[PDB]
């Protein structure tokens, strides 16, 4: 059952502070779980060819080669985070 939104306020900063989050935990979710992201979950293939194995299944070797790939990725991937910022009020904000 979704709730309704009456008395539309002005949201010149909701669309920058809340909207990206609030809908991820919008009223009406049962479970919220942690998972790997795309660009990593794609590293979890099925056909094991870094480590031969005598079986046709999803055996441990999958987990092992998955480790290998992400490990050699993190060996590489020297990145530096840079970013700009907005500047907002602090008295007209509930959370401190």
């Amino acid at each position: 059952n979704m709730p309704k939104q009456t008395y539309n306020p002005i949201d010149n900063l909701a669309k920058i502070l809340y909207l990206p989050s609030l809908e991820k935990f919008k009223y009406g979710t049962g479970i919220v779980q942690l998972n790997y992201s795309p660009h990593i979950s794609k590293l979890y293939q099925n056909t094991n060819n870094i480590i031969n194995t005598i079986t046709d299944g999803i055996t441990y070797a999958n987990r092992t080669e998955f480790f290998i790939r992400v490990m050699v990725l993190m060996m590489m991937d020297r990145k530096i985070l840079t970013m700009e910022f907005y500047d907002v009020d602090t008295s007209a904000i509930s959370n401190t």
């Binding site: 500047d87 009020d89 602090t90 008295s91």
Partner: protein, 48 residues
């Protein structure tokens, strides 16, 4: 050089509260209400 120093001085006047106190210190306080914080970020300063 007198002009550029004058610009910098006018700027000092309405930022960094604890510098300007000629004879009133009250309506200057009234003015400063609006910078939202007793410290201003750089880019704001530069654009000002």
């Amino acid at each position: 050089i007198d002009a550029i120093c004058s610009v910098e001085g006018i700027l000092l006047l309405i930022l960094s509260r604890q510098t300007t106190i000629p004879g009133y210190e009250d309506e200057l306080n009234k003015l400063r209400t609006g910078i939202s914080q007793p410290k201003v970020t750089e880019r704001q300063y530069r654009r000002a």
